[PDB]
């Protein structure tokens, strides 16, 4: 309507195109798979030990670092597999962050700090796209791992995914599409209250502009849903709880399984996290 809100449309469009380039499996594609509507993907359903073994062809367990984890018992292999998907998520999120206007002009130390605290909140936000109450798409939608199967793993691995499923059923109720999520994840990255930020001001400047864009996007894209903007900001704190819980569980897992080691990218992110 006006030049000010016109600039917020361009920003929303820029972030959407950037999100499409950065993330191979979008919520649009993910939802098409989960509802059965014809797609490239035939997801092999993993519901038990036997199905996982018969489905090893379709899951790339082969790429997990380090290699000795690839030989271990099922629960450790599944956990490491989920953690490894997170490594590939970090790379995609990092490339997306670089496309956010003003982000690469921030103090490089602050770019590192924003990503370090942002990535898992974004991982679990976007994972909700791949989830229903029954299970989660894995290996770019070539696998579907059942919720019950992930519940059944021995302690301390038995409930590591339950908090993500519980956050996902509520979050997916908002019926956000890719274009909304593209702006929401940029808002999460540009959080001025992360510990050890050197220069908060230019981060809050960028986030203020992203939040306005997100608000305009949720007015236009969901004009019949009225307080969608307000409900979404409440979730940004439910996300932090998931990440604190996940890091705490990872601490338990590292100390109960003393000869488990993590991908060095995850070691560097998890170190001095909550």
């Amino acid at each position: 309507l006006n030049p000010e809100s016109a600039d917020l449309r361009a920003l929303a469009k820029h972030l959407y195109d950037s999100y499409i380039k950065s993330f191979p499996l979008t919520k649009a594609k993910a939802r098409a798979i989960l509802t059965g509507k014809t797609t490239d993907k035939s997801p092999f359903v993993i519901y038990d030990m036997n199905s996982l073994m018969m489905g090893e062809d379709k899951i790339k367990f082969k790429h997990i670092t380090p290699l000795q984890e690839q030989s271990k018992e099922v629960a450790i292999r599944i956990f490491q597999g989920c953690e490894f998907r997170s490594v590939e998520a970090v790379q995609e999120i990092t490339e997306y962050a670089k496309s956010i206007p003003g982000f690469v002009n921030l103090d490089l130390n602050d770019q590192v700090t924003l990503l370090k605290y942002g990535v898992h909140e974004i991982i679990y936000t976007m994972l909700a796209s791949l989830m229903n109450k029954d299970g989660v798409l894995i290996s770019e939608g070539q696998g579907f791992m059942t919720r019950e199967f992930l519940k059944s793993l021995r302690k301390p691995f038995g409930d590591f995914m339950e908090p993500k499923f519980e956050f996902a059923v509520k979050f997916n109720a908002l019926e956000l599409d890719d274009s909304d999520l593209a702006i929401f994840i940029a808002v999460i990255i540009l959080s001025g209250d992360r510990p050890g930020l050197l220069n908060v001001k230019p981060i809050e400047d960028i986030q203020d502009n992203l939040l306005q864009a997100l608000e305009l996007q949720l007015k236009l894209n969901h004009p019949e849903s009225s307080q969608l903007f307000a409900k979404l900001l409440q979730k940004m704190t439910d996300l932090r709880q998931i990440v604190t819980e996940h890091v705490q569980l990872l601490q338990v897992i590292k100390k109960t399984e003393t000869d488990m080691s993590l991908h060095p990218l995850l070691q560097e992110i998890y170190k001095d996290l909550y």
């Binding site: 790379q91 962050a97 490089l108 590192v112 990503l115 370090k116 060095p264 560097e268």
Partner: peptide
């Protein structure tokens, strides 16, 4: 240091 993150952000 965050060597890998630094490297992801510079390439």
């Amino acid at each position: 240091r965050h060597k890998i993150l630094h490297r992801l952000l510079q390439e």
